[PDB]
Amino acid sequence: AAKDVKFGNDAGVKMLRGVNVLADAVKVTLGPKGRNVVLDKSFGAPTITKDGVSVAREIELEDKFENMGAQMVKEVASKANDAAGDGTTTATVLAQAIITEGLKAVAAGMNPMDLKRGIDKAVTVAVEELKALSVPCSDSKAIAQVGTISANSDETVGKLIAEAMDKVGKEGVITVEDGTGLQDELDVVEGMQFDRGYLSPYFINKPETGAVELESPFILLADKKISNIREMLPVLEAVAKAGKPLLIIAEDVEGEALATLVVNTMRGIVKVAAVKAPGFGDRRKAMLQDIATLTGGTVISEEIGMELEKATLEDLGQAKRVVINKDTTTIIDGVGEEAAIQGRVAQIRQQIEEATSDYDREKLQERVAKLAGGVAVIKVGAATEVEMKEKKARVEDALHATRAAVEEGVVAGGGVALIRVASKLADLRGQNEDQNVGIKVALRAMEAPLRQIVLNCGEEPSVVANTVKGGDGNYGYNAATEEYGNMIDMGILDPTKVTRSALQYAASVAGLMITTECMVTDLP
Template sequence: MLSRLGRSGRAGVRTFANDIRFGAEARCLLMQGVNVLANAVATTLGPKGRNVLIEQLLISPRITKDGITVANNVQLGNRRQDMGVQLLRQATNNTNNKVGDGTTTATILARGIACQGMHVLRQSKVNVQLLREGILEGSRAVCDALGEMSQSVDTIGQVEAVAKVALNGDERLAELIGDIILELGDSGVILLKESHSPFDEAKIQEGITIASGYYSPFFAKQSHTLELENCLLLLTLAKIDQVEQILPALELARLKERPLLIIAKNFGSDLLKILVLNNLQGRVQVCAVKAPSFGDEQCEEMEDIAFATGGHLLEDASSLADLSEEDLGEVMEAVVDAKETHLLQPINVNEEQVQCRIQDIRELIDEAFTDVELDRLKTRLGRLQGHLATIFVGGTSELEVSERKDRFNDALHAVRVAISDGVVPGGGTAYLRCIPVLDELPPTDIMELQVGREIVKDALRLPCYTIARNAGVDPNEVLRRVLKGSGNYGYDAAAGEFGDLVVRGIVDPTKVLQSAMTSAAGIASLLATTEVLITKQPTKPKIPKNQVTKDLAKLVGM
């Protein structure tokens, strides 16, 4: 009996062995994955870059030229190679999170730096930490040079030029973005939605935006964005721990058959589970959002939202129990994603109270002492004034709409950072103009530092080279002619001509190129200096012999 128990106990334990690779072999496996990802992403760079078609389970494929979308969909079956993919993807995600554009450029630079770094390690014994320091030093010098080269964006024409580059030369769409920026100002909020027609359309709507998204992604179900039409709004500074605290609000929403958006100081974890389960079961559509800011600022901002949406701010749990229909705000639509909440077209707003509130804030702006206080008050003023634009992206098919939305999104991010930090010549020319800066750095006797600088210098040629190659011309000849020139002289890949790129409206946001360089150097230097690679041995899942289960397993690739 004891022996049988021992055997059955051992049989129920699953063991995993680690696969360990060292030195050049480990780096070679990582580089194989890096090359796959970089080759897939690089095809999208430039005005004549190619599209990438991505399979999606059970729905139509997706077509895109967006670098971050391509990078996030590359996954390799070999775990060791896939670790290279994951590391390089960090460079794209870091750039995308900071500036929302430049992911393809970051990928190309990171692959170039990593490849050169690994080549150096194969040739001789070097101090890898000093090599990494040399690469990072070179990237910092490039970022400083880009900052000095930057030109401010002062006109709508320059804004449209930035948008045109991100939109692959589409002048009409660039003018649409320029008109919206002219209407809203550079701090206006712009949303993207799918149109039900083949045409693009922009609408300016009244609404407010708060810098806080849904508490849990499960509120949005399959999508990354939750849209609530004809929505009720509960605003409170109380921490909501029990579902009983919000039962009156939930009951009102159920009776009126309208969704409910709750913005509160905090939520209990058990309550969130109940609300998510409620959503999944289709009872009352509800979403939980954390109140913006902290302390006194939180109270002021929540009061602003209450004024702007026609509701009342409930300050404690006792007021939740006595809630009435008049306490709830109302908006025609609420759009909630992971980072922001947009409240569109408020209903039943007391305009006199709102105008009094706006006047009070303007008086506070006149008395403000610090820049931080001034920025906060201006943000509150813009929220109460409530202008927001929605671009309805059209197309003849779902594939086209998806691809155009990606391009619109990149263009909007590029415009934002261009307005805040300026622009430099596009087409990879700005990076080429940074090469002399690296040559002028103070000489060093440490071989690894100098090699690191040279690695960065070689990588700076890659964006221009890739754009020319995607355009179907001789990339070496393009590089030679652009390097021979100076200033804004570069290659216009869309027209197939050389000239002053700034005059031609081919510019890149300075911050995008700086962020791409910084992210690429950091990730690539870690890749190049990796010595040991540890992965789990793959295990084949046991699939029951039931035919239906077999079919499902086959469908998901098991």
Template sequence: MSKQIIYNPEARQRIMHGMNTVARAASVTLGSAGPAVLIQHRTDGIAPIFTRDGVTVANAIIQEDRIADLGGRMLRDVAGSVSRQVGDGTTTAIVLARIIASECLKSVAAGFHPLELKKGLDLALTLVEQHLHRQAVTGVTADWIEKIAAVATKSEPGVGQLLARALAELGADGTLSFQLGSALQDQLDIVEGIHFGQGYLSPYFVTDKTRNEAVLDHPYILLYDREITDLMNLVPILEQVADQNRPLLIIAENVHDQALTGLLLNHIRGVFNVVAIKPPGFGDKRLNRLNDLALLTGGQALHEGRGDQLERVTLAQLGQARRAVITAEQTTIIGGIGDQARIRQLSRSLRQQAEAIRAQKPGQGSATGNRHDIDELEERIAMLAGKVGHFQVGGITDVEIKERLVRIENAYMSAKAALEEGVLPGGGVGLYNCLPAIAEVIAENAEQQQGIAIMRQALAAPLQQLLANSGLSGETVLARLDAESDRRQAFDIQHQRYGHFLEIGIIDPVKVTRLALRNAVSVITTLMATESVVMEIPDLSIMDGYSPEWAAATREDPRM
């Protein structure tokens, strides 16, 4: 396929145009006063997406100019990375990346060397991160979590209390799943659950396209320690499960192509609802995890070595649970029917084994092996004793519920981030207060000094964008904050008042703020070093004679 090469300055100009397009649409969602964005669904007849989430807006924008779309993709990557790490702060990251990119490209056009600018930005980033850690307020309380949730959800009433309760009962390492509720009010249900890092074997198992999850209600659970190669071996148990009108979760060493294809075809056609995953653990430890799952779900782990045959499995040998939620990377099983007394007994036994290893004197056994054994035991104990929370998001319409679900899930991740690194003044003030940390820095040369100057402009950008979204005078607010001797003062845009950030509830987690800035700098410094873009020229002749209307009516593709 032939290639198209675009050189600077045209390449950078078109990339920057794409960034501006995405940032202009997404940045309006920043802050509690920020308006929402309405996104047309790609399928006709389905309600549009109503969102106040920056990464959702960015992901929805695909530009016709492919070079400009590269710029938009950079912002999507920045926001997506922050979203995956901490949930909140996606729009802040977009705003930061846009201003840094804009100022860097101006500087490069003026003759500054990109690599020297990068050194200046990296130096400023290091100093800002150190300042953020020094200014962090740790020892996060339930009251702070409520206020953090209020900021992240744009002042949703009652959400903060539920999230604070979830974190109190589950802990920072606990699992809280979110789903669309059927009531007007939000509901939090915390139950005993099993959580481990194995996802579905094929994305075609997905039942919830919006969240890319496979959800099974009241499933039977088949536990098998070997690979499944022949679908016919599964047919007897599949028929028994289908007669009960319930789904089946298969946990096996692997499901080979032929058997997996058969499962997927029947699953897609609605013959039966089934999902296949691998068990947790690795190597010789995997058998222990399979036995643990059997104990937790009230089933029996099938071992071919002791004569268990897949084609002779009965319903009595299967585990059961109230619900299973499987994503591409992890599985959560809620409400297993295992014997709690036996589970507690096994947990005590595992703890005793772990304590015995810890009590060994130096030189007894391999240090690396001992550490590995302790880690394995602790992971099994956590799975046996774990709790899982279930947050049902309420609302009047599906559009409203889906929009709230994203914000509430982001708020939960933001609260967990606050527990890790502490909090600081929110509403863009935390970054704005970092300006003195780099005000007096003298770099090695003028080009690096220009990179530090660009960082100074970026630190003020989120606060300025927040004020612009609320229609307030930025100069007045910035002057008042500059006049404050207490660096923990913040500005409540919604109620237009100043005060200590903990008292007025304008709180941001340090980790969210730090990662938003770090990801923005990382992506944009890559852009600066770009001198040309190589793109494939698409062959449009393959679409000759293609009519979407005709293809939809006949279910055929004329290109075939």
């Protein structure tokens, strides 16, 4: 269709309106004195929320150019939450700030490329500073502490995380499930996690996590690309006959049969999901067999002359639960027998004996780690169903935060780490004068989160900013208590990983947007 094309400042002003509606809507929620947003539904009563992720998801604008600005920012900010388990709204506030002053400097005639190099340099240095400000979280006491801070001062949830991580390693795989009584339970089970997400966003049966969650599912392991649905039917019917759902792990599931599964779980005919097999080439064939042993399935590979048509229920692996992400699949409680699994482990542990290369060795150690590592299952107990489900959410949150915290540490929260590192880079320069204003744009954007948080408090953001910058280390403002103090002692902190990712992703789209000369979209 015919297009509407825009250039320079005209494109600029349009993306900036787009970004301002997005950011303004989302940022009202920020911090302990954040405000409600009402989002309408055709479904019934509108929803009242402080969740900036929810607000973002609703934002779509009538003018096509503005809307392009908004969607660009949404896309990139949400990469923060994916990477770190939090950060999206902060990314949004950062992006609004860099963009607003970046485009001003563009309208004043400064070189866009230079502005971007400057912003990027300030970000690189600030991230080094974040890393230096950061306090490690790597012993059991610290783990419990961070966990109980993220879980709203619930010393129990802290305990639970620390016990899980102790049972299975800090880097180990942990899930959370509904409890069975009053008591919390923790046990370790046969299972595995690999880095492959769902093949379409549509299998997602649990939109609040944005996850696919299946109970007592059969698992089809097929070493080959699945284009045709013809090959599926014989198995697909036999599965519908046992009334259980189905996971497809294949080399790929493409165009044709993919679209079919999508529509056929959509109507509730069968609950199916499909993910790519892990890795490539040879390490792929072998990992498929790992999963097979884990789940008591058989690999259907056409190099041995097997077809998907001549495949019964017997061939399929089984597990108590599987959970799939945008970029993760985790298999919990595999029917596979303890003897068969032990044998496969000893087998691999033996290829480790004869690997004649570093690389072959690491690749094998990673497979045994998965198979022989299991999965920790935290089952959350409480007094009523309502309390249980709320604790489960609290545990789930605390677990993501604590995971991030063991990775890269913890830093002053409530916006303070960001402003802190900015106040240390006042002397930073670039190859020339536009780069220098680039730098200044980034550094001033780093105050946005704290200024917003203080604005939700109804206090004067520039006075709080000014006082915090004046101090040293983790000195900052506690918006909960409206008092100054050492943010770490007051227990107000973010995982470094989230602060880092917010900043990096905000600076990414801001950079792209400040260096865009043309936009193209369809005529209304």
